[PDB]
Amino acid sequence: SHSMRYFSTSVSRPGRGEPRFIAVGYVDDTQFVRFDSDAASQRMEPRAPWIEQEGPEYWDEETGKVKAHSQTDRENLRIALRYYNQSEAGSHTLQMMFGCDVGSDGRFLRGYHQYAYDGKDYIALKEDLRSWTAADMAAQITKRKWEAAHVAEQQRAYLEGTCVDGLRRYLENGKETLQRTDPPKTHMTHHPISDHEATLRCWALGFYPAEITLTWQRDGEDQTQDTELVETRPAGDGTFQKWAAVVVPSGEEQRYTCHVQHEGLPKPLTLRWE
């Protein structure tokens, strides 16, 4: 089960100048491409090794498409500004995300196409890929106009086609990064904060993909009420980190177990302190 995803972000800058446009492309948890309008290159750039031996034609096409989207969203910021009747002194944000999910057989699962203005949902293609979901009165203006240009059928063909074609091509080219699963390297730490209580911390480093599950148990009974968990976070090398800590009364340290679930493990881990 793999996914490809594109994230674009347009931000108006009145008082500083023309808007800024940023777009990144991800296959699963790995970025492989970027475009910054403020950057000097004015080209779509690679961010993964396995995307570089696409041709000059590819990079030409992709540059054209992302610069086009860029210009389009610059105009959409203006149209929104009069939709919502807002001043031109304000700095506003128009985000767009789209992409597709393919199954284990290499075939279509989900399609995504989504807009947001200033952090709130605007209009979003529904899973059935035949209709839109307008989130307010202005988005309904957009919904009706698009429903009269059969835009959703145009996006279907991309999502069910082009996107899955690219994603699968990519998956094969980055087969040795995208399709391998690094298991977490796990260790446990002991941290006395008293002579009665002590902090026990379960680590998970160097894993990929990012979906992980760290749990603490006391005598088989979960301890989610006394557990401190941190968000999964990028290590910076393409792998992710996470830890879960619990405070234990001195002497009861062995009754505690740390429980790890990842794709790259044959079966779960149970960790005990010694």
Partner: peptide, 9 residues
């Protein structure tokens, strides 16, 4: 690969 979406809102 990227989308060819030119639609105004």
């Amino acid at each position: 690969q990227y989308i060819k979406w030119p639609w105004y809102i």
